[PDB]
């Protein structure tokens, strides 16, 4: 079926939970043996969220190459993403090592450091220009260059230096700061405006390594971001946009990391975002200026 009318049919029939459970039943199951080794217990935030062995990012290090991160490679859309957990106190150095080694330009953060009164990830970037960060275990230095705080998100420019070679690179940090503690946003307008800002920066383009995207576990909000991006790209590429099947794209992405889209509400929100975004793309360029007002 098409998307917008499949949508109204699930709303009127109140069957989002049944649709979402079907996806869970059909999703791939692949081994994650490296994640479960005892030496990696303090490298995982959640015991039930692990990268598959076949798609995990390897650190370039002979002692322990493990990080809880997965490469999602979308063949038809020609987009790749790295989805990862929020860094832990003992993995912030690994996190920036991965950014360096994979040649990423951008980092997409969809959570706050504290939510629901608990810590959801480490404070892994510097908050003041004059107070840079040194990661001694991986030999990297990180400096805040500038910061632009808007109503729904903040963009930061960061300098990452490999202290071994004295090479430096500019990393863009895109921080969506207004996802509610419970549930999903009532309108997708600010999330889509945020997605378009990431796109406009070059961070999703083939001349760079894959964007690094995270929330707390790296499967829920993070899955919503890459699912919406990929579906909209396919609608622009194909002769028949109504042939894009959001459930099939989600199952394809779940071949690469478990658990993407954590609730039936996140699934419905993903539909809403793709539907509204397809109107602004066209050919409705004026659509854009509208997301930024509402
Ligand atoms: O669906 C699953 O099998 C599954 C299994 C284990 C853990 C979770 N997710 C979480 O605990 C979470 C994600 C974001 N914040 O917490 C899901
Ligand atoms: O050799 C290349 O084509 C190549 C490949 C990956 C990454 C980069 N560099 C950057 O993304 C960058 C911009 C600012 N700091 O790092 C260059």
Q: For the domain that residue 196 is a member of, what is the CATH number?
A: 3.90.190.10
Domain total in the chain: 1
CB 3 within 8 A of CB 275: yes
Q: Three-state DSSP class for 22?
A: helix
Place of tokens 């709303």: 11
Q: How far apart are CA 229 and CA 195, in angstroms?
A: 7
Closest residue to atom 3 of ligand 1, CA basis: 259
The 8-class DSSP code of residue 209 comes to: B
Q: Three-state DSSP class for 68?
A: strand
216 in a known ligand binding site? yes
Q: Which domain holds residue 217?
A: 1-294
Structure tokens at 38: 């005892």
> Which residue from 44, 183, 219 has its CB within 8 A of the most atoms of ligand 1, so it is best to mutate?
219
CB 56 within 8 A of CB 34: yes
Experimental method for this entry?
X-ray
> Which residue from 120, 250, 259, 265 has its CB within 8 A of the most atoms of ligand 1, so it is best to mutate?
259
Residue 289 CB partners (closer than 8 Å, separation 6+)? none
Tell me how far the alpha carbon of residue 70 is from its chain's centroid.
11
> Which residue from 84, 250, 262, 265 has its CB within 8 A of the most atoms of ligand 1, so it is best to mutate?
262
CA dist 76 to 202, 230, 259, Å?
A: 20, 9, 22
Closest residue to atom 10 of ligand 1, CA basis: 217
The alpha carbon of 9 and the centre of ligand 2 are apart by a number of angstroms equal to 46
CB 176 within 8 A of CB 191: yes
Nearest ligand by distance to the CA of 215: 1
3-state helix, strand, coil in the chain (%, to 5): 35, 20, 40
Place of tokens 């106190």: 89
CB 215 within 8 A of CB 149: no
Angular region, 237: left φ>0, alpha ψ -120 to 50, beta rest: alpha
Residue 189 CB partners (closer than 8 Å, separation 6+)? 276, 290, 291, 294
Closest residue to atom 13 of ligand 1, CA basis: 217
Hey, which residues are catalytic here? 215
- Pocket lining: 160 vs ligand 1, CB cutoff 6 Å: no
Place of tokens 């490296």: 34
- Pocket lining: 195 vs ligand 1, CB cutoff 6 Å: no
Tell me how far the alpha carbon of residue 24 is from its chain's centroid.
20
Q: How far apart are CA 45 and CA 98, in angstroms?
A: 17
- Pocket lining: 49 vs ligand 1, CB cutoff 6 Å: yes
- Pocket lining: 262 vs ligand 1, CB cutoff 6 Å: yes
Structure tokens at 197: 């800002």
Pocket residues: Cβ below 6 A from ligand 2: 103, 105, 169-170, 207-209
């Amino acid at each position: 079926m098409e998307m917008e009318k499949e949508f109204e049919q699930i709303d009127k029939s109140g069957s989002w939970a049944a649709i979402y459970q079907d996806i869970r039943h059909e999703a791939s199951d692949f081994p994650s043996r490296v994640a479960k080794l005892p030496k990696n217990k303090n490298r995982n935030r959640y015991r039930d969220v692990s990268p598959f062995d076949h798609s995990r990012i390897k650190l370039h290090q002979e002692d322990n190459d493990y990080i809880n991160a997965s490469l999602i490679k979308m063949e038809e859309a020609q987009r790749s993403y790295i989805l990862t957990q929020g860094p832990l106190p003992n993995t912030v150095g690994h996190f920036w090592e991965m950014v360096w080694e994979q040649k990423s330009r951008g980092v997409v953060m969809l959570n706050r450091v504290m939510e629901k009164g608990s810590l959801k990830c480490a404070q892994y970037w510097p908050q003041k220009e004059e107070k840079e960060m040194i990661f001694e275990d991986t030999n990297l230095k990180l400096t805040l260059i500038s910061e632009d705080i808007k109503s729904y998100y903040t963009v930061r420019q960061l300098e990452l230096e490999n202290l071994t070679t004295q090479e430096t690179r500019e990393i863009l940090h895109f921080h969506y700061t207004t996802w509610p503690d419970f549930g999903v946003p009532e309108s997708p307008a600010s999330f889509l405006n945020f997605l378009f800002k990431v796109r406009e920066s070059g961070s999703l383009s083939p001349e760079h390594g894959p964007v690094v995207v995270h929330c707390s576990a790296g499967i829920g909000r993070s899955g919503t971001f890459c699912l919406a991006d990929t579906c909209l790209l396919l609608m622009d590429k194909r002769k028949d946009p109504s042939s894009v099947d959001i459930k099939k794209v989600l199952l394809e992405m779940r071949k690469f990391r478990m658990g993407l889209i954590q609730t039936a509400d996140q699934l419905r929100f993903s539909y809403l975002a793709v539907i509204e975004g397809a109107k602004f793309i066209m050919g409705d360029s004026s659509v854009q200026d509208q997301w930024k007002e509402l």
